[PDB]
Amino acid sequence: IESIIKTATDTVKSEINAELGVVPSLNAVETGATSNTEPEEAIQTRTVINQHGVSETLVENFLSRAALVSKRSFEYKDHTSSTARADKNFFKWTINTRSFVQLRRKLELFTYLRFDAEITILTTVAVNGSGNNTYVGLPDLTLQAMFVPTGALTPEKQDSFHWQSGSNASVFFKISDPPARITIPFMCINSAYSVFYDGFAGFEKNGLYGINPADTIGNLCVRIVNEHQPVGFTVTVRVYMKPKHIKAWAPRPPRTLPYMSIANANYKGKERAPNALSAIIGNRDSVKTMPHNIVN
Amino acid sequence: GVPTYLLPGSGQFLTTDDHSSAPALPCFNPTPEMHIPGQVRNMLEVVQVESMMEINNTESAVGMERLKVDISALTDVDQLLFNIPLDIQLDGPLRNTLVGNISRYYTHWSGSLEMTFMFCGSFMAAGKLILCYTPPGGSCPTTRETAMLGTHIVWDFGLQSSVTLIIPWISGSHYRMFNNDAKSTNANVGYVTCFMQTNLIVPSESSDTCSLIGFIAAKDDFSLRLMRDSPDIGQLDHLHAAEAAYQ
Amino acid sequence: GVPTYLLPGSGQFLTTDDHSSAPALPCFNPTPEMHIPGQVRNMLEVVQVESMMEINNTESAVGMERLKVDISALTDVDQLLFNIPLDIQLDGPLRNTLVGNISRYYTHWSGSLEMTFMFCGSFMAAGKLILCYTPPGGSCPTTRETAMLGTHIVWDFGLQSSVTLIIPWISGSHYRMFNNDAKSTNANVGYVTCFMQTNLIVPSESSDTCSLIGFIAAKDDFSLRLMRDSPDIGQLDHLHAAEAAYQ
Amino acid sequence: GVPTYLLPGSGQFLTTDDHSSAPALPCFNPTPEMHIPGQVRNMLEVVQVESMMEINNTESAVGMERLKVDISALTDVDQLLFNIPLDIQLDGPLRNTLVGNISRYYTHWSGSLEMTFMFCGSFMAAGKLILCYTPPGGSCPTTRETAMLGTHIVWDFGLQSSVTLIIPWISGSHYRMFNNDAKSTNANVGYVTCFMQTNLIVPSESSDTCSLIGFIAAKDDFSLRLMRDSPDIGQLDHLHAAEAAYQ
Amino acid sequence: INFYKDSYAASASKQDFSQDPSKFTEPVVEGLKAGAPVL
Amino acid sequence: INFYKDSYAASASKQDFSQDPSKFTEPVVEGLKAGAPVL
Amino acid sequence: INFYKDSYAASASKQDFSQDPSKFTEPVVEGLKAGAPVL
Amino acid sequence: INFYKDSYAASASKQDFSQDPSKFTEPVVEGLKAGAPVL
Amino acid sequence: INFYKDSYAASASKQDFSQDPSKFTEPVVEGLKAGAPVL
Ligand SMILES: Cc1cc(-c2noc(C(F)(F)F)n2)ccc1OCCCc1cc(C(=O)N(C)C)no1
């Protein structure tokens, strides 16, 4: 039954029990129900007024923490002789929450999640030392982060006319300013994001497995607004996401084996325990061996 | 205008801060909420669900073999069958459980735990066991006459296949700590041991070896504090296809 | 003074922010408002207006030839006449319409659409057609017996020159997405096909070929979300005379 | 937005500032309070507790020998026995006391002090002493006839082993200062002297030398102002094992 | 302090203390009684 | 939050939900009835 | 000025003027009277 | 918003709409009437 | 605007218009009358 719980339950003192037909310590695991044996029925207890709060385990508190989701370094310089794969004073990122394991594991403790996302962008710069290993100071550059939704065109160069951002939301921020911050609303086409999706994204058979197309977000495009300086710099952009106004459903067994890919739940496990495919828990000599036995 | 001055901490980015921030998409209407079964609002609801302990965490056990303990008929009385370390922070049988996994995101804990064991022998198998919880202070008991001095339940196999051993919260301090010093007075919980009470007795046609499955969960007096990054997951490199997101 | 501290995001320029700002011209009196016909307050009013589809988007059709579909008398029964892709994000017959143009400024959409066809043959021309909407999942139907299993209207030419085929909002999700993967389960709407129901029959003095004009509009259950830059316009250089503004 | 301007002092870190600051651990529930004996809410409660003076601060006295003053039978009358400097800021008998230690965290002080002396001779020992407080202005009296002109108590040894000499707050100014110029008119308190009133007379079997223990404390009219770093503790290098905290 | 016009801009909501652990601990049609044998 | 003296300095106004699509969808002198033939 | 949600974030509390020096100056079962001999 | 103690620190005053153009357009002792000859 | 807890932190007080110049201009026991000779 639903109830308001703010503190851990109190204990009531209990007396000796010898009652025919009453066996509170016996249970039937087969029904799928967790044992309902109370401490007062297993041992003789005292009265305890428990004042311990439970607020820190609230789902909102558990998940509403800013966590790294994206980290991209690119060179800020004249890119006239750069390769096609190089980030030429800008980068684009297909938004996902599966690249950094600390946040991914916590999110994957649930099947469905509904939340708004607070986005914080932190920027750092360093002078390039390759050949030009001389320090002149760090420039206070202006950056543009543009949110490109599904079906919109992404910029192809630092001076692309797509950056005019007629309708796209863009934020211009300086390195010397505090990190830029914006809130993205819950934008799923369903009532909640599908943390896990046991299905295929297309009406043919070649679509990607395990990614619900309803949760597609889009692209984050970040460029340096300043034209390049005579010397080269390395710019690192870090994006943090904090869920808020959270609703969660259907908790799941936690991830045990190391993650392999951001596209699937493929698993290999460590070479040996702990967290190996054949042994999650570290081994002990035998079931009668106390690993940290206290002697004297 | 309003005269103001900036305090220390102005301009900082605290990952646990709680403020409003500018909406990037004005006038956006989120999809209407729909009822979905299995909503969870406090993580303590998850830790209250029973999950299997890895009691048989030995090199000889592979896969789900590590999730059951085999017991056979013995020819000596009062024999020890197995013990269970009670440290959640260390790598032990309780670590990969709902309670253990959720708790290892925190640093402090309090409240009672419950261990439930299901006997999975044949209907014709019979036996009695004693399950003991020894509060900390000494060595893990190795004999029944010593183990039975602590909290214990004598379990008679029968129609009800499962028994529950309550590990009551017996602690000097309000909370304990998930600290790597397993012998610290702020962390050690004690021991759980299982002895034969009479014997496992089965007829010739039944299997002479029977298995128990041990489950653990927290009672509703359980609580946790001081959120921390779980040591159960980590990465030393970027995951495969992570780079492709930037292509 | 008032103690204060700066939050993350302070000093940023968010193009979608909504704040007051300093008036550059104090005490300026704007010209008094005057009633003007045709005021529009919500863009959904525009998408509700019928506009012509470019059904005949083929290399042989030039100019407004692409805005009509020619139908002639056939000597075989139940023949397919044309089909219409229902993807607004892709470049198809629905893209250059009021609904299509306005919607392509957004990413998500929901609600019913209506297709209206006007027969522009002579008064003496007669015929019956069947217009079918097939919910997604399979291939576009190529035969009448398959197409007629879906939503359809049988159209009899007559004094009322136009018929309406309703494309009801039949979707698993609340919204669909204008995404470049036309085969995605979050984007595909299905197909619209047109078959002869009986035949086009005209007398010798009437034109033996008659044209239909197809229109499309959204019903008042239509909605859009997640504003985006329209991919229908772009520039690779400055427009002519733009530099002269700085001279 | 709100027009604002930054005042002088904005962004400074004042070690004595008093502001709210961002909680690093949201929703943390501190351990419930429990009654503990001996709560102290104002440091003036500590200075009101008697503590021993180091009257015998001489090279010949080692350890706790410095905490008692020996008195013997004399063959001349009205002899001086000891005096006590009354400067708390200077290094004297009052410095390592509760009142002295706590006060040396402050710069200004006011109020009355009380000196209590316990006679620790044998039951058979008898004698009378005069304890005098001389307000400042001149030299410390060296004769009884001069010392007895000031505030004094004549103490008769007996069943009540202890006598109290009140040093009343006699000051031109509201407060005095703990300044290194002991002869300043804002700091000097005067002198305390002890003379034989009659003599120490003991029988042959009793010890011919008897000890007094002097205690000092402030009355409840005592107060302190202008917190300062105590000169009683300092370090010229890092303490041992301090570096190990970073390893 | 939320002066933004869109409600989703607000700070976090940490005041939902409602619980129903029986959804996961006792999802059986027939509720079990204390002391009485389950089977 | 608008402390400026000129009203046009204020933030945007996104609260005008009035609509009249018939201005563009049905600008005919004789209104049409549901089901009844138009002609 | 405390707009934080957690109470421990507040500024210092310097308004507790309650005292009980007798806890340290007179922790005896039998209270002593003024003037009367203690022993 | 004026938290200064001296009144002359305040912002501008643009609310004095009083007019008397006759001081400059008709500074004659004998007021003129509409239509009637001035002389 | 003073949010500090110590009163001496407040801004200046320029509202004490009390005067008594006779303390310096006429500190005589016998007050002098207008017109009448002082001596
Ligand atoms: C990281 C980010 C950045 C921006 C952005 N950066 O700049 C701008 C600009 F241009 F306005 F300035 N917008 C926008 C949105 C972003 O992500 C949205 C998180 C939503 C989500 C879904 C799931 C999921 O699928 N689940 C839980 C199964 N997880 O999270």
Taking a C-beta distance cutoff of 8 angstroms, is the pair B203, B124 a contact? Answer: yes
Cβ pair B5:D6 closer than 8 A:
yes
Hey, is B54 helix, strand or coil? coil
- Through-space distance between the first and last CA atoms of chain E, rounded to whole angstroms: 56
* Residue B11 CA from chain centroid, whole number: 41
- Given resolution (angstroms): 2.0
* Omega before D3 within 30 of 0, i.e. cis: no
Sorted by sequence, the CB contacts under 8 Å of residue C207 that are 6+ apart come out as: C121, C122, C125
Method of determination used here: cryo-EM
Q: How far lies C210's CA from each of C123, C124, C165, in Å?
A: 11, 11, 20
| Stretch (H or E) spanning E25 | helix E22-25
Ligand 1 midpoint to CA D245 (Å): 40
Taking a C-beta distance cutoff of 8 angstroms, is the pair B128, B157 a contact? Answer: yes
Sequence ranges of the domains in chain B? 1-247
| Stretch (H or E) spanning B81 | strand B80-85
Cβ pair A249:B232 closer than 8 A:
no
- Nearest Cα to E23, choosing from B45, B102, B99? B45
Phi, psi for residue D132 in degrees, rounded to 5: -125, 140
Structure tokens at G26: 């007179």
DSSP C176-241: EE--S-TTBTTT---EEEEEESS--B--TTS-SEEEEEEEEEE-TT-EEES----TT---SSPPTT
> B-chain residues within 8 Å CB-CB of E16?
41
CA–CA separation, D3 and D19 (whole Å): 23
* CA-CA-CA-CA torsion sign (C84, C89, C94, C95): negative
CA–CA separation, D197 and D75 (whole Å): 13
Residue H34 carries which DSSP code?
S
Cβ pair D20:G2 closer than 8 A:
yes
Q: At residue C36, what is the residue type?
A: I
CB of A169 closer than 6 A to ligand 1? yes
Cβ pair A56:D28 closer than 8 A:
yes
> Within a 10 A sphere around the Cβ of A18, how many other Cβ atoms?
5
* Cβ contact H–G (≥3 pairs, < 8 Å): no
Phi, psi for residue A239 in degrees, rounded to 5: -115, 125
Sorted by sequence, the CB contacts under 8 Å of residue D143 that are 6+ apart come out as: D78, D80
Looking up tokens 């370090």, which residue turns up?
D235
CA–CA separation, A239 and C154 (whole Å): 56
| Stretch (H or E) spanning E18 | strand E18-19
- Nearest Cα to F38, choosing from C131, C167, C161? C161
- Breaks in chain F after (C-N > 2.5 angstroms): none
CB of A117 closer than 6 A to ligand 1? yes
Phi, psi for residue B101 in degrees, rounded to 5: -60, -45
State how beta strands B209-218 and B162-167 pair. Answer: unpaired
Taking a C-beta distance cutoff of 8 angstroms, is the pair A207, C183 a contact? Answer: yes
SS3 letters across chain D: CCCEEECCCCCCCCCCCCCCCCCCCCCCCCCCCCCCCCCCCCCHHHHCCCEECCCCCCCCCCHHHHHCEEEECCCCCCCEEEEEECCCCCCCCCCCCHHHHHHCCCCEEECCEEEEEEECCCCCCECEEEEEEECCCCCCCCCHHHHCCCEEEEEECCCCCEEEEEECCCCCCCCEECCCCCCCCCCCCCEEEEEECCCCECCCCCCCEEEEEEEEEECCCCEEECCCCCCCCCCCCCCCCCHHHHC
- Nearest Cα to A256, choosing from B215, B60, B97? B97
Ligand 1 midpoint to CA A117 (Å): 6
CA–CA separation, B191 and B196 (whole Å): 17
The nearest alpha carbon in chain A to C14 belongs to A171
Residue I23, CB-side half-sphere exposure with 13 Å CA sphere:
4
Determine which residue's CA is closest to atom 29 belonging to ligand 1: A97
Taking a C-beta distance cutoff of 8 angstroms, is the pair E26, A34 a contact? Answer: yes
Looking up tokens 């922070």, which residue turns up?
B89
Angle at CA of residue B205, ends B200 and B211, nearest 5°: 40
Taking a C-beta distance cutoff of 8 angstroms, is the pair C216, C50 a contact? Answer: yes
CA–CA separation, A241 and A193 (whole Å): 15
Burial (CB count within 10 angstroms: exposed 0-12, middle 13-18, buried 19+), residue A136: exposed
* CA-CA-CA-CA torsion sign (I16, I22, I24, I27): negative
CA–CA separation, B187 and B90 (whole Å): 11
Sorted by sequence, the CB contacts under 8 Å of residue C26 that are 6+ apart come out as: F5, F6, H14
Q: Is I4 on the interface with C (CB under 8 A)?
A: no
Residue C155 carries which DSSP code?
E
CA–CA separation, A124 and A126 (whole Å): 7
> E-chain residues within 8 Å CB-CB of A38?
34
Cβ pair B18:E11 closer than 8 A:
yes
Structure tokens at A61: 């508190």
Angle at CA of residue I5, ends I4 and I7, nearest 5°: 90
State how beta strands D4-6 and B2-6 pair. Answer: parallel
CA–CA separation, A296 and B138 (whole Å): 7
The nearest alpha carbon in chain F to D1 belongs to F1
DSSP C79-128: -EEEEEE--SSSSSTTTTSHHHHHHTT-SEEES-EEEEEEE-S-TT-B-E
CA–CA separation, A159 and B246 (whole Å): 19
* Residue A38 CA from chain centroid, whole number: 36
Q: How far lies A166's CA from each of A152, C36, C233, C238, D9, in Å?
A: 12, 27, 11, 16, 42
Q: How far lies A142's CA from each of A125, A177, A229, B115, B226, in Å?
A: 12, 10, 13, 59, 38
CB of A184 closer than 6 A to ligand 1? yes
Sorted by sequence, the CB contacts under 8 Å of residue B75 that are 6+ apart come out as: none
Structure tokens at A17: 């029990």
CB of A193 closer than 6 A to ligand 1? yes
CB of A97 closer than 6 A to ligand 1? yes
Phi, psi for residue I29 in degrees, rounded to 5: -65, -45
* CA-CA-CA-CA torsion sign (E13, E18, E23, E26): positive
The nearest alpha carbon in chain C to B10 belongs to C5
Residue B99 carries which DSSP code?
H
Strand residues in chain A grouped as ranges (E): 3-4, 26-27, 67-76, 90-94, 110-127, 142-149, 170-174, 180-184, 193-194, 218-224, 233-251
CA–CA separation, B235 and A275 (whole Å): 13
Largest Cα–Cα distance of chain H, in whole Å? 59
Q: At residue F7, what is the residue type?
A: S
> B-chain residues within 8 Å CB-CB of A262?
239-242, 245
CA–CA separation, D71 and D196 (whole Å): 9
CA–CA separation, A56 and A72 (whole Å): 33
CA–CA separation, A122 and A238 (whole Å): 5
Taking a C-beta distance cutoff of 8 angstroms, is the pair A172, C12 a contact? Answer: yes
CA–CA separation, D13 and D8 (whole Å): 13
The nearest alpha carbon in chain B to C225 belongs to B28
Ligand 1 midpoint to CA B243 (Å): 18
CA–CA separation, C31 and C155 (whole Å): 53
How many domains does chain A fold into?
1
CB of A141 closer than 6 A to ligand 1? no
From A162's Cα to the closest Cα of chain C, the distance in A is: 8
Q: At residue D38, what is the residue type?
A: G
Sorted by sequence, the CB contacts under 8 Å of residue A184 that are 6+ apart come out as: A116, A117, A118, A119, A147, B24, B25
Sorted by sequence, the CB contacts under 8 Å of residue C96 that are 6+ apart come out as: C54
Taking a C-beta distance cutoff of 8 angstroms, is the pair D48, G21 a contact? Answer: yes
Question: C-alpha dihedral over B115, B121, B127, B131, to 10 degrees?
Answer: -10
CA–CA separation, A200 and C117 (whole Å): 36
CA–CA separation, D69 and D55 (whole Å): 7
CA–CA separation, B192 and B135 (whole Å): 9
Angle at CA of residue B200, ends B199 and B202, nearest 5°: 135
Hey, is C15 helix, strand or coil? coil
Helix%, strand%, coil% for chain G, nearest 5: 20, 0, 80
Largest Cα–Cα distance of chain E, in whole Å? 59
Q: At residue A135, what is the residue type?
A: Y
CA–CA separation, B126 and C152 (whole Å): 71
How many domains does chain F fold into?
1
Structure tokens at D39: 């709560």
Host domain of residue G26: 1-39
Sorted by sequence, the CB contacts under 8 Å of residue A66 that are 6+ apart come out as: A118, A120, A240, A241, A242, B13, B15, B16, B17
Taking a C-beta distance cutoff of 8 angstroms, is the pair D106, D226 a contact? Answer: yes
Determine which residue's CA is closest to atom 3 belonging to ligand 1: A119
State how beta strands C2-4 and B2-6 pair. Answer: parallel
Taking a C-beta distance cutoff of 8 angstroms, is the pair A37, B170 a contact? Answer: no
The nearest alpha carbon in chain B to A109 belongs to B102
CB of A113 closer than 6 A to ligand 1? yes
- Through-space distance between the first and last CA atoms of chain B, rounded to whole angstroms: 49
CA–CA separation, C10 and D136 (whole Å): 63
Q: Is I3 on the interface with C (CB under 8 A)?
A: yes
CB of A195 closer than 6 A to ligand 1? yes
CA–CA separation, A20 and C212 (whole Å): 88
Burial (CB count within 10 angstroms: exposed 0-12, middle 13-18, buried 19+), residue B71: buried
Determine which residue's CA is closest to atom 15 belonging to ligand 1: A184
Q: In sequence order, what are the beta bridge partners of D210?
A: D71
> C-chain residues within 8 Å CB-CB of D8?
none
Phi, psi for residue B196 in degrees, rounded to 5: -60, 130
Q: Return the ligand 1 atom nearest residue A117 CA.
A: 19
Q: In sequence order, what are the beta bridge partners of B126?
A: B201
- Through-space distance between the first and last CA atoms of chain D, rounded to whole angstroms: 49
Structure tokens at D126: 């008898």
Angle at CA of residue B239, ends B234 and B244, nearest 5°: 155
Cβ pair F37:C41 closer than 8 A:
no
DSSP A56-83: GGBHHHHH-S-EEEEEEEEEES--TT--
Hey, is B189 helix, strand or coil? coil
* CA-CA-CA-CA torsion sign (B61, B62, B68, B73): negative
Sorted by sequence, the CB contacts under 8 Å of residue G27 that are 6+ apart come out as: none
* CA-CA-CA-CA torsion sign (B16, B19, B20, B21): negative
Tell me which CATH code domain D1-247 carries.
Answer: 2.60.120.20
